[PDB]
Amino acid sequence: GSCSKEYRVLLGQLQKQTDLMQDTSRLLDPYIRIQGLDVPKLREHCRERPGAFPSEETLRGLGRRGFLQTLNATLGCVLHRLADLEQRLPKAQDLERSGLNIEDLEKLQMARPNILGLRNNIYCMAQLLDNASDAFQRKLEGCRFLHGYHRFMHSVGRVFSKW
């Protein structure tokens, strides 16, 4: 929350956190598992949705404050989509009977707190700058959405590494 800040330390925190969030084993994979999508043929159908997320090229074209603003607005949309996905996710009390893993649900529950933490650091940095479908189909969209989110964070970590 608080904004204890020396520019280089904060930037180090942002580089570290964003480079970590690109890792598909943290959200996308447990998601595929807990929704029963972990079968080879279905997996290939979990690819990013073209235009769902800003390209690395658009992100690089932005300029410092613009980058933070676009990043922050996107994470906003992500938190909302995530809140929606989470409500439709199997409930902890039904996992055993359905043969699912509580560890996958626990990993998935870190998504929101992690993103809020990143958003807080983004605001602190901004302060340092001088200025339809059935249920089956919906699970697949969740798939594609998370895949796009991880690729997006990858692009984001790349822009930060050159800060």
From Swiss-Prot:
Single GO BP term: oncostatin-M-mediated signaling pathway
Superkingdom of source: Eukaryota
UniProt-annotated glycosylation sites, renumbered to this chain: N72
A GO CC term attached to the entry: extracellular space
Cystine crosslinks: C3-C124, C46-C143
Subcellular location as annotated: Secreted
Membrane recorded as keyword: no
Post-translational modification, as annotated: Propeptide processing is not important for receptor binding activity but may be important growth-inhibitory activity.
Similarity annotation: Belongs to the LIF/OSM family.
Full protein name: Oncostatin-M
Gene name for this UniProt entry: OSM
Region of the whole protein represented: 29 to 212 of 252
